[PDB]
Design a protein around this ligand. Structure first.
Ligand code: HEM
Length: 154
């Protein structure tokens, strides 16, 4: 789990992100789909879309952006309550394993894009203590999502 200082570091960072949650979520996903075109295969309204301006304006992209940011928000705000973070990430993990059939490695890829976007957009607020805290959060997400895939015999 995150230590108290790490949790505080992650929540303070996340608050800055979430002040324009909508735009940050979308910028993250556009970068994800441009840089990893294979990930678009799970999205019916944009699986063959290439123009990043259209991706930015895509209703189904912006919707998934809103749901990624909201589920992340739930995890970050409730990091002091580890049963809640377990709860949320299971539900996500399973859902993506079973309904959406997404290869679990795409979570690792998306997290790397999330890191790249955070490092760019909020660099002057991203000291090493915070970078390390954020990296623990990423590990936490990937291990919990990865355990949920194993749980239903992926
Ligand atoms: C931090 C990681 C992610 C979070 C928190 C997240 C969150 C969500 C949530 C809350 C939903 C709506 C409920 C549901 O139908 O499951 C959703 C839908 C979906 N997600 Fe994710 N997601 C993540 C990563 C991914 C990745 C990497 C992919 C595939 C590359 C993906 C593919 C989908 C698809 C195909 C849907 C259905 C969208 C639709 O109904 O049009 N997600 N996501």
């Amino acid at each position: 789990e995150l230590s108290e200082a790490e949790r505080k570091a992650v929540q303070a960072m996340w608050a800055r992100l979430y002040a324009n949650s909508e735009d940050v979520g979308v910028a993250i996903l556009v970068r994800f789909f441009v840089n990893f075109p294979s990930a678009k295969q799970y999205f019916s309204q944009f699986k063959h879309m290439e123009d990043p301006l259209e991706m930015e304006r895509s209703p189904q992209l912006r919707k998934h952006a809103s749901r990624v940011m909201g589920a992340l928000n739930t995890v970050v705000e409730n990091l002091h309550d580890p049963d809640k973070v377990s709860s949320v990430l299971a539900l996500v993990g399973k859902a993506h394993a079973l309904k959406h059939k997404v290869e679990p490695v795409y979570f690792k890829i998306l997290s790397g894009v999330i890191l790249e976007v955070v490092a760019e957009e909020f660099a002057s607020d991203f000291p090493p203590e915070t970078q390390r805290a954020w990296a623990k959060l990423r590990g936490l997400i990937y291990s919990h999502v990865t355990a949920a895939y194993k749980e239903v015999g992926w």
